[PDB]
Point group: D2
Chain length 212, copies 4
């Protein structure tokens, strides 16, 4: 994954790549570009607006949206498909509940009818979601990265200012996760992230791949 704007040199986003932009205006501008994304070019084949995933507000980000739960539930059912001895138990438990309640409908004085219970119905009845209420920014960053692991239509996650919140070993565990799961993410910072390699465009317009 490749982008270019004012640099006149293409930056390469492979796994977890850090881009620090010292001058606030140029940082405000690249940020504005990222939200207006459509100038600013993302690649070979140009990225579709819909394949970009941007977060600035880590805690406000809704990770339990309707679409994301759909995939999670899809995978949970799959996982449970591969454990026939468990799926089996579940089926017999739900079957029994249905016979049981079935009887009640009969003894009920109106003309009652039922279908049955499939696993998705169970996921929905259980209130299955990602836990977020007790999240630290670190725990949440991780949760956002994993949703990205899943959202295979989302080609690039850009974090903005996310590092201003994390301790240095915290940044390393996020990187280790991104490395290990073959996803690509850009951290866009205005202040240098300590003890690692990063692109830096400095107070003047000198682009370098230094370290801190």
């Amino acid at each position: 994954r490749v982008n270019f704007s004012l640099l006149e040199e293409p930056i390469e986003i492979e796994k977890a790549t850090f881009l620090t932009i010292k001058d606030v205006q140029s940082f405000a501008h690249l940020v504005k570009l990222i939200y207006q994304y459509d100038n600013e070019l993302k690649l070979q084949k140009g990225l579709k607006p819909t394949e970009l995933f941007v977060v600035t507000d880590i805690l406000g980000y809704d990770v339990n949206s309707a679409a994301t739960l759909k995939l999670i539930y899809g995978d949970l059912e799959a996982q449970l498909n591969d454990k026939p001895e468990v799926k089996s138990m579940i089926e017999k438990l739900t079957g029994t509940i249905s016979q049981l309640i079935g009887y009640e409908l009969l003894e009920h004085e109106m003309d009652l009818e039922e279908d049955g219970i499939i696993v998705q119905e169970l996921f929905k009845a259980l209130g299955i979601k990602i836990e977020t209420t007790s999240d630290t920014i670190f725990e949440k960053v991780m949760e956002i990265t994993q949703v990205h692991r899943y959202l295979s239509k989302k080609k690039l996650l850009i974090f903005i200012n996310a590092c201003t919140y994390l301790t240095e070993d915290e940044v390393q565990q996020v990187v280790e996760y991104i490395s290990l799961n073959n996803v690509d993410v850009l951290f866009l910072e205005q202040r240098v992230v300590q003890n690692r390699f990063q692109y830096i465009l400095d107070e003047n317009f000198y682009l370098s791949y230094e370290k801190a």
Copy 2:
């Protein structure tokens, strides 16, 4: 129970025929307009306490407000069969445990609440069966549903008795008696072989046969 040209007393299944079509139309209008024509208790009826059907097969017996009342009642019936409820409680508990393990094995921080019996009712698709209904059956169903909707003091059917054999009518008239529900049947053709208020072409109020 009391409604009014002359005051009429509605209790169990009562029949009102109007043979002059215009005055039948006019009354049916007034029935749909209700808020001019006045309906009383033992000594004032609010619109939400009145309930009307012309389209017997189209009426949704499975509407959410009614499904609530049946579910409530179905749960009460569970509650009063303590060994059965306990069986269900532990079976849904066991499910919640199993799925909960699966949550732990899944890579993300996953959470679940629990399964209560109303959720089971909604997951099974508990409703009143209607697909196979005959007009006759649907009238029976609608009538029961009238026993439950006790904020609905009076039920009016219009032209029901044109769909129904004189024997079905009597079934229904009885069934209504066993539930002590007040329902008015408004017709335009006399209902054969029974006592009905009649308002004839020449506007004479009769209690005939």
Copy 3:
């Protein structure tokens, strides 16, 4: 359009069908309400989707002012307006003037405000444009349902059940009079004979005939 259930009766314009036996009247009503295409009632052209069918028993209760009906009526209403261009341009010029004025008000306001335009539909919707139904008689409502049947091109067959029990002999004529004018196929289904007109009849012993009554 055509039905068989037992043989076949063409329904062209305002056509009446009296089923004199109550068992059979009820059976057929059930068939209509259970209509899908795979089941035992058959309605033609050949073709006829359930989505294309349109049945009303309860007339006062029918919602003539639904969103999907109103979209069609507004559409017609737009066209009637394009057929009188001097009125049309006056509307465009008058909404134009509106938009400029409110525009200047967006400029003078502290905040950075933006508008787009007013198009006729938006005017219809701001006008509370609907069919008046509060004061309806059954007769009046029956006209409106017929009228709405006409504008819904997707609805090929309208069916009224027991409509003639609320309607005087004069009133019936006019519905038929309207129906013919507009080339819409509506079937009136009855249990009693309709006074003084041509109908199909199924008698208590199941002979079908086409008679005045």
Copy 4:
């Protein structure tokens, strides 16, 4: 106004937290605001009285409840310019009648009520413009929105000053002091050239000019 996890929020007030773990911890505390570990006082603040932004450009300024309030103010404005209101009502009036005849000649029994200004604003899609915003511009708009929502007693911007030059912050602060609202700027690095509370690398609170 008053803050503790003991700080007085008045007009434009900045609070810098130097240890990232503290910062993180407080930001989280802000997103959980109920009345638990940290507290905001006039008497307590309800969570609907609170108003936090981190994602400036993402923030929906054009929400149904905010628009409600602009429209009322726009309407108020209109009413105060009676020559204009009078022109608008004539225009809507004439339109009403033209369509009026068209309904009378329509075959169906067609009915209309009328047009009031609020409906006018709605058919226009009156909204705050944001597609072209810079972060600065958006920051002004949100500050404006805060000025309309009497209900939110406090606005908290987090990391706002990583996107803003010294001169722009200064324009934001001029605006706020002037329209007199309470907005807290929570940062993790010192904002040049102004007074701000500072939490040291623990645990000392001081109120200096940087």
